[PDB]
Amino acid sequence: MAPADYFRVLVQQFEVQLQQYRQQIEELENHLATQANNSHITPQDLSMAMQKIYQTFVALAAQLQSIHENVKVLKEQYLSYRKMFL
Amino acid sequence: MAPADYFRVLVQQFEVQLQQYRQQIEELENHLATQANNSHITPQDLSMAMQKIYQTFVALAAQLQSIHENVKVLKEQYLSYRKMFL
Amino acid sequence: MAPADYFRVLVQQFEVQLQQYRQQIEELENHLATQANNSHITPQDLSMAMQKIYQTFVALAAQLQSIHENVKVLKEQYLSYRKMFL
Amino acid sequence: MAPADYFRVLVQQFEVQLQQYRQQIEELENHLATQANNSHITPQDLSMAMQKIYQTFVALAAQLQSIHENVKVLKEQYLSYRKMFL
C-alpha cells in the first residue's frame, strides 16, 4: 500500500537477510576453528572455505539487488509526482 | 621456513580477517536496529548501509585475494618440484 | 511520563547495554587470538582473561539490576491500580 | 603429554567457549530488535531476555570453572615438584 509501508517491509526484509548472512559467516568460522585445532586445515580446505565465502556474498547480493530495484522504483515514482507538482 | 609453517600463518590471517569481517557486519546490524528504534530507517539510511556492505566486502576480498596469491605460489612451486622428479 | 514511555526508555537502554557487552567480549576475544597465534598464552594470561570476563558480566549485571528495579516498580504500581479498580 | 600441550588444549576450549557465548548474545540482541520491529518489547519479553542472559552466563561459568580446576591442578602439581627440589 502506502509508500512508507512497502518501504518498511523492504527494510525489515533487509535486516533479516543481513542476519542470515552473519550467521553463515559465523557457521563457516566455527567449522574452520574445528578443523584447525583438531588437526590443521589443508590448502584444499582453505579453498572450499574461500569458495563458500564468495557464494554466501552472492546470495546476499541477490537480496541486495532486489531491495535496490524496489527502492529504485519507489524513487523514480517520487520524482514523477515531484515534477508534476513543481 | 617449511611450506607448512607459512601456510598455517596464512590460514592464521584468514581466520583473523574473517572474524574482523563478521564484526563490522555485526556493528552494521546494530546501527540499523538503532536508527529504527530512535525514529525510522529512511531510503538514504538504507543506501549508505547497502554501500558499506560492498565497501566492507571489497576489503575482505583484498584479504582473500592476497592469501589466494600466496597459496597459488606455493601450489605452483609444488608442481615444479613435481615436474622435476615426475 | 506515561507508563509505556518510561518502559521503552528502559528497553532501549537495555539494548544499548547489551551491545557494549558483546563488544567487550569481542575485544577480549581478539586480544586472546593475538597473543595465541603470535606466541602462546600463559596460565597468567588465561587468568587475567577469566578475570576480565567476570568483571564484564558484573558491569552488565549492574545495568540488569537497575532495569529490574525500575520495571519492578512499574509492575507494583500496576497491581495497586488493578486492585483499586477490581 | 607435556603440561604445555594440555594447557594449550584448555586454552583452546576457552576460546571456543567464549566464541559460542558471544554468538548466543548476538542472537539475543537480534531477537530483541526483531520483536521491537514487528510490534514492541513488552515487560514479559524483557524478563525472558533478562533471564536468558543469566542462563547463558551460568553455562559459560560451568565452562570457565572447569578450565579453572584443570589449571589449578597443573599449578598445584607445579608447587609440589617445586617443594620437592626447592
CB–CB contacts below 8 A, A to D: 14
- Give the DSSP H/E element, type plus range, for residue D1: none
Q: Which residues of B touch A29 (CB under 8 A)?
A: 15, 18-19, 22
Resolution of the solved structure (Å): 2.8
Chains that touch B (3 or more CB pairs under 8 A): A, C, D
Three-state SS annotation for chain C: CCHHHHHHHHHHHHHHHHHHHHHHHHHHHHHHHHHHHHCCCCHHHHHHHHHHHHHHHHHHHHHHHHHHHHHHHHHHHHHHHHHHHC
Between the alpha carbon of residue A52 and those of residues A26, A29, B52, D23, the distances in Å are 12, 11, 21, 20
**Nearest CB neighbour to D32, from listed C15, C22, C50:** C15
Dist. CA A51–CA B48, nearest whole Å: 27
Closest by Cα among A21, A6, A5 to A63: A21
CA terminus-to-terminus distance, chain C: 24
**Residue B19 near residue C30, CB atoms below 8 Å:** yes
**Residue D64 near residue C28, CB atoms below 8 Å:** no
Dist. CA A11–CA A71, nearest whole Å: 10
Instruction: Please give the single-letter amino acid code of residue A84.
Output: M
Instruction: Please give the single-letter amino acid code of residue B79.
Output: L
Which residues are CB-contacts of D42 (< 8 A; sequence separation ≥ 6)? Answer: none
Would you give the DSSP letter of residue D4? T
Dist. CA D54–CA D25, nearest whole Å: 11
Which residues are CB-contacts of C47 (< 8 A; sequence separation ≥ 6)? Answer: D71
What SS3 state is found at B77?
helix
Dist. CA B53–CA B45, nearest whole Å: 13
Cα dihedral D67→D71→D73→D75 (10° resolution): -170
As given in the structure block, the three cell numbers for residue D83 are 617443594
Which residues are CB-contacts of A22 (< 8 A; sequence separation ≥ 6)? Answer: B22, B25, B26, B29, D26
**A48: containing domain:** 1-86
Which residues are CB-contacts of A59 (< 8 A; sequence separation ≥ 6)? Answer: A21, A24
Scanning the structure block, which residue is given the C-alpha cell 557487552? C21
Closest by Cα among D21, D37, B41 to A16: D37
Q: Which residues of B touch D37 (CB under 8 A)?
A: 33, 36
The count of other CB atoms within 10 Å of the CB of residue B52 is: 15
Scanning the structure block, which residue is given the C-alpha cell 525514529? B39
Dist. CA B35–CA C68, nearest whole Å: 25
Find the residue in B nearest to C29 (Cα). Answer: B19
Between the alpha carbon of residue D43 and those of residues A36, C10, C31, C75, the distances in Å are 43, 10, 37, 9
Concatenated DSSP letters for B6-50? HHHHHHHHHHHHHHHHHHHHHHHHHHHHHHHHHS---HHHHHHHH
Closest by Cα among A29, A44, A43 to B8: A43
Scanning the structure block, which residue is given the C-alpha cell 563478521? B22
What SS3 state is found at B3?
coil
Q: Which residues of D touch B26 (CB under 8 A)?
A: 26
Looking at the structure of chain D, the number of domains it has is 1
CATH number at residue A65: 6.10.140.1350
**Residue A25 near residue A56, CB atoms below 8 Å:** yes
Method: X-ray
Would you give the DSSP letter of residue D2? -
* Partner B contacted by A8 (CB < 8 A): yes
Scanning the structure block, which residue is given the C-alpha cell 574482523? B20
Max alpha carbon distance in chain D (Å)?
A: 69
* Partner B contacted by D33 (CB < 8 A): yes
